[PDB]
Design a protein around this nucleic acid. Structure first.
Length: 39
DNA sequence: GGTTTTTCTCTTTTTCGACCTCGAATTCGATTTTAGATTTTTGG
């Protein structure tokens, strides 16, 4: 790297809130297939 | 009258209590800008 510049984050970054979910249904066993990914 | 056996309590274990208690994770209402429109006022 010959020329280095620090830049602010939100200048080059699109932030968006989640698309609306109702994913709290009655059974979501391993027979199903989506990856439910949390912290 | 004495000895032995059985039982009862007291000493020590031991196993339960529509629980409970710490880490991890977090959905709805409360509240705010912006999009936008409509109405009113001022200027030409």
């Amino acid at each position: 790297g010959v020329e280095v510049e620090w830049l602010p984050l939100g200048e080059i970054t699109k932030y968006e809130q989640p698309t609306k979910y109702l994913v709290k249904a009655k059974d979501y066993h391993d027979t199903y297939t989506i990856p439910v990914l949390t912290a």
